[PDB]
Nucleic acid binder design. Structure first.
Lengths: 84, 107, 162, 97, 398, 98, 98, 84, 97, 107
DNA sequence: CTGGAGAATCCCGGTGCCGAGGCCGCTCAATTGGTCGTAGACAGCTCTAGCACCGCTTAAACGCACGTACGCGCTGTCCCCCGCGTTTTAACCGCCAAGGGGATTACTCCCTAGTCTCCAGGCACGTGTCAGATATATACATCCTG
DNA sequence: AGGATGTATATATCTGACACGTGCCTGGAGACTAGGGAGTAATCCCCTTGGCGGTTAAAACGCGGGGGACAGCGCGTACGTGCGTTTAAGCGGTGCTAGAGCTGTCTACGACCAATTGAGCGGCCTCGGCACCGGGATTCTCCAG
């Protein structure tokens, strides 16, 4: 398996705008996109670390939807519609 | 005589026996009272009925016969008390309430 | 009938022991001691030999089990850093402790982190312990140590490591 | 060979839905969200009841503990109506016993 | 400025003799001399007033103040430019323009103390996982460096991987590895490279805060010694505090636990005599008292203790009855020495290093005198030993 | 001349569009690649259920949308209609994330 | 002619004074009266431990100090050094309160 | 006993200023004092309701420090130093 | 007669303090705060281990559960060092029996 | 004679007391032998970590004794402990000195 | 302020297919019934601590006056972001194939629960002796004109 | 630079809150037995990963311009500072008794176990919701007038 690199740029500029539109933002500065990518990366690192911790505890090689749901729940971000 | 479900005795739809077993096996207390599962089932059923009634109203507004996550989200967020109850909850495929700040509108 | 052996790896820290067992650890526990038996494997033409290696982690100096560290051992490797010669200080003490607790068990002195090289000449001439330059991070003579121990333990002067 | 039986609150949520909205349905994803919601409410109330029992050095989770957990967790009129429904259910259950 | 003085500042000029293993140049006779079973003369351009043996290197201090050094320079223990091949096996002047009065060789480091009271410290420190640096974490001083202290230092004693600096006021400053409690101020939770705070905790000098054992005031020490992995600090009142490794009862403790804070050792607690000297290897301790009698305690294997053959592990100081009155005692890794008050020197312990001056590799369980052409008509002034060699300071007799 | 909407008309139209839809707004494959890249830092050769990545994306988009709502309030509180990085920083600092 | 400090000087002096101390900043008896008044709407003839009111005061002071930290951050964000009610409302709205 | 009234005014303007200074505030608007009192009233209503509920469940008539600690902990405002 | 005994981590906290700071003391309020801190840590780790056992359908809270809870709860270096200390303690305990 | 489990584990914290608390707290049906030892080790490590910084703060303040103010300073000046105790209020702890640079005089 | 032009959105009336709702068989989880032990209810007592009240002292709060420095509105500038056309890119879809690994079942044994003894570790009291709180004089840093 | 004010620093000087020692008792250690939880091994199949080609919607880029951010300036008043006056907090003390805490006795309520059966799950099938294409009707925006 090849090592992935430079995927945070896959969160394209228009994708961040659409998230801003759903957030009710009318005008966006050009420096917002890099900040948003950094924030998203921090959030995903925090969630995925806990998900992988749960997975490793279960001795699984596969991160299941329940691992992600538990990881979100223990961060005060309960998620409905995926189990639990 | 045919066995009577504890739900029917309590006048509920939710499973009193299953909730009792979950309480007993959930590592909550050494012992579980007889009336605890009945009360818990009644509360869960009441909350589900509230959410489902608001979701059905939302579905009717959107001219849909069927409840989808969007209607659950609208019902939960348009109700102050349910919104407070589920403040830390994200509903998959729920979207957001239409809300544009007045300062952003034209003119 | 797999041939298996218990090898005790004694040396000063930062000499490459952890990176020396792992480079043969293809991929258990000494409950008495508290150190993980690392199962190295070397096929040899005579038949497989599995050096169950437990690193004392220096507990032979700072520990309390006394003879417990060596008593189960059937062979030993004394490792030191030939780029930090200070790590030859304890070799005679380890040698005496091994020959005492375990009696006549084969022991090998391995010079790690070797890569001027005038430093390593001195120990090659000492006649008490066999000296091998193992280098590491260069895979230069990383089967030479264990080959000598297997030759002595199995008693065959012509064992190879197919 | 059938798959192992996996339990859910789906049929009961459906019965409640048919009670409140006789002609309305529900999608599978909405049903999953509702099942998660019911499980979350169960977990919250049970955890608060367990804490109440432990704080008062009680080995039992009675309907008193559940009522107090409901009052602590649900806000405003939701708590009042939940307590009313629970008291009604327990009274009816004890009457038929 | 004041001039520091201590009872350990040797000032009698004498000749340096060495015996044992010289694989990495610790004997001082060059490349042609690797092993010397009997003491052999070492040529220093100026008369030496102290000759200290480290783990694998030797530091000789002259009469005029110039520190000479020789031995393994892998981690900079010699504190001088050893680029030229073979300069490690012959004493060369350490380029420290200050006038030195005392030196102490650890294992991969050396401390020189100046007349003013400033410690010059070169080499590095090693823990059980590699090198941890000298004053900056993970960096080693190849040349003399001044240890920043607010107080002058009257004595420096080095174990294997720690340095105990005794200030003029009596405090005790420690730095180096603290995994086995030798520093006396780093708990076990933090002994593994200072934990989160990092190696700045193990390598910046700080006092050994020994509770309020003096009531409002802390205990003030008058002498401090170092075995391989443990420290003995004799208080003003005579009490002996020992922090370090005690798995073989080499601290005099009743158990085998490592003492991570200084512990008043009840084994030595006495009033009819006083303890005036200490020295240890890894697992044994030899100490002398004001009466001139030498005791041993700790591991008993290979005759470390000097107690007659068949002696078992001792957790209390045992008399080495075979010795006459002794003026100084020294310990190697597995050996021990006693210098008689009339100049003779006795040895005991492991002999496979040829450290005993007997000419044989056998272990001497009872103390025996050292002889040789380089000791006849001479008086031994001091003896020090390391892992594999013994450095003797001798004087011509009238 | 070609017909043009004034700056902000299309922005409001888009706001109305995306506050009425529920579709995921980040392209699916790039987000999966990002998740797999972040994961390999914690354990090599991890596998993800198709729903595991979907849950992560729902949570991520919800978190970002909620963050942009607080960012918008920060911008308006400064009498601006444009969101700037300092707005995100304020929203996160008040939320307790910084 | 009489000595006066320029505006904002004694304010900074106080900021230093009250960020060094740990004493409670609200007066004890008024806070106890407030606690009892609020409690009488939930149950009648209640008794309060001394440490119950002290715990409530500690929690309230910590909450208000944190809220004022957030309010001060919001006010500066608007290029102001003065905190206004709109600043508290922003802090509470972003925190998820109200 | 007597019924209390209009005690939120006991949270005086100087007292709110001191809380503001400890919070790093240099200049305070005149309308903050009435806004702060409302926030404090809401917070204490939320906290005391749960404490009184815990007391009622215990069948006690005295609100204890542990009741307050549990009420605070139930709101993500853990409080050390009172026997938690 | 003496009052009923009330347990606390006061003496153990004091021994730890003496280990880390032989000369420093501690007051009563600081002792209460440290006791509450220790209790909070215990409760957090125990609850997370309980969830880990329930998720994996296990009836036991072992050292694996406590270790995973520690990794889930403590941030970064605290988690690493605490895991190391716990493993060392368990290894020392097992070797003596 | 009887040997303490804490002594065997090399710990100051009570392994037996923690074992009883785990067995009685409705945390799980069974509790393993190493669980109390691991948990006691972690609790002791965290207590020592907080106490080392608290004592350092006391020494910086020239105080022989640790008070809640020192604990607050130790916790809030340490990033990891601050994150661990983000939602905790230390009674009589106070706040860290912090004045926004904009509020300071122009100079 | 009005009346067209566009562009976008909102209503259709028409198809199709796929998920929701129902049905059927099975099995295991809930219901009955009975037994037993202890947890919680209730009564009674103790005495802790919370409520209440008064008097005296005084630091804190309230109210005021004067001046300023900050909030906030208006004007300009310019540059940066929004909208629109064009081009490039890669996401998405559908399909196929190969294994890794999740989920399950059987068996064994070793670890933990439950008991009974015994005793010593940890708690509650009680006492002493410093670390910290206190008051005072002083030196030093800072701020405000100048 | 110098004056005025506030704060930090160095003695004092008690005060009572740590820190320790003693006695007791109850809970933790040790020894032992019983059973079932889970660790291992083996099996099955599902669902995850990888690849591959086509379509086309979305992303990226460049343009032109207008409107929004930010700087500057003016000015009005609201806040800070500081003084003098008023009042309520805090402390010390006393007393009453309400209720928290504890103990003892009892019983009824839940746990546990064994037998029975129907409630709910899995799997299968069907067709009515809703999604998706075309085709107009309003809505709304923009600007020439």
């Amino acid at each position: 398996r090849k090592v992935l690199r430079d995927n945070i740029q896959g969160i394209t500029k228009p994708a961040i705008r659409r998230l801003a539109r759903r957030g009710g933002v009318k005008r966006i500065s050009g420096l917002i996109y890099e900040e948003t990518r950094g924030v998203l990366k921090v959030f995903l690192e925090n969630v995925i670390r806990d998900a992988v911790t749960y997975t490793e505890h279960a001795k699984r090689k596969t991160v299941t939807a329940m691992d992600v749901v538990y990881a979100l729940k223990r961060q005060g971000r309960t998620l409905y519609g995926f189990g639990g | 005589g045919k066995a009577k479900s504890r739900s029917n005795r309590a006048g509920l739809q939710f499973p009193v026996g299953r909730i009792h077993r979950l309480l007993r096996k959930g590592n909550y207390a050494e012992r579980v009272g007889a009336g605890a599962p009945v009360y818990l089932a009644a509360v869960m059923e009441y909350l589900a009925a509230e959410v489902l009634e608001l979701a059905g109203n939302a579905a009717r507004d959107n001219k849909k016969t069927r409840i989808i996550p969007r209607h659950l989200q609208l019902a939960i967020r348009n109700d102050e008390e349910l919104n407070k109850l589920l403040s830390g909850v994200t509903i998959a495929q729920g979207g957001v309430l239409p809300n544009i700040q007045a300062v952003l509108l034209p003119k | 009938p797999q041939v298996q052996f218990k090898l005790v790896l004694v040396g000063d820290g930062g000499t490459g022991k952890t990176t020396f067992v792992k480079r043969h650890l293809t991929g258990k526990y000494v409950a008495t001691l508290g150190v993980e038996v690392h199962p190295l494997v070397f096929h040899t033409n005579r038949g497989p030999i599995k050096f169950n290696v437990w690193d004392t982690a220096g507990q032979e100096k700072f520990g309390g089990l006394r003879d417990g560290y060596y008593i189960q051992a059937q062979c030993a490797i004394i490792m030191f850093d030939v780029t930090s010669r200070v790590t030859y200080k304890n070799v005679p003490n380890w040698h005496r402790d091994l020959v005492r607790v375990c009696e006549n068990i084969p022991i090998v002195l391995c010079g790690n982190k070797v890569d001027v090289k005038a430093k390593s000449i001195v120990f090659h001439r000492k006649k008490n312990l066999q000296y091998y330059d193992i280098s590491a991070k260069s895979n230069y003579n990383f089967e030479k140590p264990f080959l000598w121990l297997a030759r002595k333990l199995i008693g065959d002067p012509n064992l190879e490591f197919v | 060979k059938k798959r192992k039986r996996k339990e859910s609150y789906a049929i009961y949520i459906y019965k409640v839905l048919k009670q409140v909205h006789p002609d309305t349905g529900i999608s599978s994803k909405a049903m999953s969200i509702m099942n998660s919601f019911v499980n979350d409410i169960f977990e919250r109330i049970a955890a608060e009841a367990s804490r109440l029992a432990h704080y008062n050095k009680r080995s039992t989770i009675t309907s008193r503990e559940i009522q107090t957990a409901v009052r602590l967790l649900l806000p405003g009129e939701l708590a009042k109506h939940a307590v009313s429904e629970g008291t009604k259910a327990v009274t009816k259950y004890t009457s038929s016993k | 400025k004041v001039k520091v003085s201590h009872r350990s500042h040797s000032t009698e000029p004498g000749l340096v003799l060495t015996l044992g293993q010289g694989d990495v140049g610790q004997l001082g006779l060059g490349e042609n001399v690797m092993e010397r079973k009997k003491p052999a003369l070492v040529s220093i351009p100026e008369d030496v007033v102290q000759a200290e043996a480290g783990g694998m290197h030797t530091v000789c201090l002259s009469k005029s103040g110039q520190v000479y050094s020789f031995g393994c320079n892998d981690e900079g223990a010699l504190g001088r430019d050893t680029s030229v091949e073979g300069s490690e096996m012959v004493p060369g002047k350490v380029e420290l323009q200050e006038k030195v009065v005392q030196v102490s060789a650890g294992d991969s480091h050396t401390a020189a103390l100046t007349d003013d009271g400033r410690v010059f410290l070169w080499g590095s420190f090693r823990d059980n996982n590699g090198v941890i640096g000298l004053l900056e974490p993970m960096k080693k001083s190849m040349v003399p460096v001044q240890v920043q202290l607010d107080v002058p230092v009257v004595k420096v004693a080095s174990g294997n991987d720690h340095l105990v600096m005794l200030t003029a006021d009596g405090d005790l400053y420690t730095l180096g590895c603290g995994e086995q409690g030798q520093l006396g101020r780093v708990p076990e939770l933090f002994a593994n490279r200072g934990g989160r705070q990092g190696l700045e905790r193990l390598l910046v000098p700080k006092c050994v805060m020994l509770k309020s054992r003096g009531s409002r005031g802390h205990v003030r020490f008058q002498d401090a010694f170092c075995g391989a992995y443990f420290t003995f600090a004799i208080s003003h009142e005579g009490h002996v505090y020992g922090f370090g490794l005690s798995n073989y009862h080499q601290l005099g403790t009743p158990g085998t636990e490592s003492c991570f804070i200084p512990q008043n050792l009840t084994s030595f607690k006495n009033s009819t005599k006083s303890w005036v000297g200490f020295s240890g290897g890894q697992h044994h301790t030899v100490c002398m008292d004001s009466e001139g009698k030498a005791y041993s305690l700790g591991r008993a294997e290979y005759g470390r203790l000097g107690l007659g053959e068949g002696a078992e592990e001792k957790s209390i100081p045992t008399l080495i009855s075979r010795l006459p009155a002794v003026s100084s005692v020294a310990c190697g890794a597995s050996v021990g020495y006693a210098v008689t008050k009339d100049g003779r020197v006795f040895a005991w312990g492991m002999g496979t290093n040829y450290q005993l001056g007997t000419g044989q590799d056998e272990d001497a369980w009872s103390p025996v005198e050292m002889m040789g052409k380089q000791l006849e008509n001479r008086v031994v002034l001091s003896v020090s030993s390391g892992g594999q060699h013994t450095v003797l300071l001798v004087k011509d007799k009238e | 001349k070609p017909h043009r909407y004034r700056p902000g008309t299309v922005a409001l139209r888009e706001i109305r569009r995306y506050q009425k839809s529920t579709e995921l707004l980040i392209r699916k494959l790039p987000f999966q690649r990002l998740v797999r890249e972040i994961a390999q830092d914690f354990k090599t050769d991890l596998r993800f259920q198709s729903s595991a990545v979907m849950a992560l994306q729902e949570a991520s988009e919800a978190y970002l949308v909620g963050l942009f709502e607080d960012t918008n309030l920060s911008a308006i509180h400064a009498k601006r209609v444009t969101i700037m990085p300092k707005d995100i920083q304020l929203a996160r600092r008040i939320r307790g994330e910084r």
